[PDB]
Design a protein around this ligand. Sequence first.
Ligand SMILES: [Zn+2]
Length: 75
Amino acid sequence: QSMALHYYCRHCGVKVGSLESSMVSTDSLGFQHLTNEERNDMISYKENGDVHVLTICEDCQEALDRNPHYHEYHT
Ligand SMILES: [Zn+2]
């Protein structure tokens, strides 16, 4: 199944790596004994990857490419 790092966007807070998590249970960490999804990750090695990366989404990339560093701070 299509699995990798969990992508959460820098600044705009969009989930860039979580859409098909409904059937692709690789997004949820097997904490203890929650759902069947957690039961699957309950293996002695996080199958979900243990990866929470903050990256640029399409939107922010365009904030990037269309605006120099996506505007300035204040001055
Ligand atoms: Zn973004």
